[PDB]
Design a binder for these strands. Structure first.
Lengths: 145, 146
DNA sequence: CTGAGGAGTAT
DNA sequence: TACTCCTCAG
């Protein structure tokens, strides 16, 4: 269970299945978008996220990615737990997070990002949603095509 | 999408994930226990099943395996002769080979080829219908290790 | 699109 | 047993 770069996985490498990512140690969960671990200490820190579709993530062609937290979608408030919490803790720990994007081979490794901040939003249903702003660490290869 | 043996996959070969089976063309669905195709030409025929646990099915030490159909088990309801279930039934008369993968306490073994000998329906206490398929291992194949 | 479906893993 | 940015055939 590694943090940051994973041996033999280059930026721009592609995959067909979420489990391929598991087999290479890029991202362990088969569905959950957020993957994390426990630090020397006690706390959770994120190690990787997958942005397909589903949650209304804001990504385009920039170094910034807005990622939605998990939970609640009968709708209910999201909770600062598990993945969500892991990500928040990654803000202060300032650790690298692997990012995989889904695509219209359905997944690309997009390199390393840092969690700059988070905040909460309110849909019309009235329920709470977390948003995490991640920025791509400078200096890495760009994406093909 | 092949019927019967798949190139380079030997009886007793093991796997950790349902998707490994997909990558090799042994079994395509990621969760659904039954995999099938359309015959020429052409109704549904089963091509592979996965027996883990969950659907209470009978996997003793023999050449015979009783496999439960999918559906109804959330509120219980009759299973339907559709998709996989139907595919299996049609494999009875077509008499085509079916690949069988067993889960294990690497979590999956390729167990070779079987034929669907018959089916029938059962009734749980809930009152709803469940299908059962009797499959028999085609003679002459390697045995399982351990 | 839509969700049925012998998943996968931590908790 | 909870949970979950799955996967693909209808």
């Amino acid at each position: 269970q590694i943090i940051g770069t994973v041996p033999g996985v280059e930026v721009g490498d592609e995959f067909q299945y979420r489990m391929e990512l598991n087999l290479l140690g890029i991202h362990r969960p088969s569905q959950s978008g957020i993957d994390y671990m426990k630090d020397d200490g006690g706390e959770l820190v994120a190690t990787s996220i997958v942005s397909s579709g589903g949650y209304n993530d804001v990504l385009d062609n920039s170094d910034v990615l807005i990622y939605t937290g998990q939970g609640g979608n009968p709708p209910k408030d999201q909770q600062l737990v598990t993945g969500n919490l892991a990500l928040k803790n990654s803000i202060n720990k300032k650790n690298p997070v692997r990012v995989i994007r889904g695509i219209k081979k359905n997944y690309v490794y997009d390199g390393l990002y840092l969690v700059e901040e988070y905040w909460e939003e309110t849909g019309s249903h009235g329920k709470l949603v977390f948003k995490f702003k991640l920025r791509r660490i400078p200096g890495q290869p760009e994406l093909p095509w």
